[PDB]
Structure 1
Amino acid sequence: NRETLDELESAPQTTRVRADLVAIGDRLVFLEALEKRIYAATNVPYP
């Protein structure tokens, strides 16, 4: 019966983060390099 009222719940708390945002097409996309952030000196292979 064109049911679309499945949920409308929170819109939770938000902050502000330095991230890397570009514009490709009409889709605004992140960018992130994961070498220095999470795999710094960890001796686990980067996938």
Structure 2
Amino acid sequence: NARVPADLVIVGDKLVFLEALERRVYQATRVAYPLIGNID
């Protein structure tokens, strides 16, 4: 055990949880990957 709120939201009669990955990895340089871009 090691306490933390990485914590709990709820969806139905559950709980769920929401604080998601844009707080931990990789700023400011120069190449690319899978993801969003475009589709016909």
Q: Same fold (TM over 0.5)?
A: no
Pick the TM interval, shorter chain: 0.3 to 0.5
Q: Using CA pairs under 8 Å that are at least 6 residues apart, name the structure with larger relative contact order, 1 or 2.
A: 2
More strand by share: 1
Q: Bigger radius of gyration, 1 or 2? A: 1
TM-score where L is the length of structure 1:
0.39
TM-score where L is the length of structure 2:
0.40
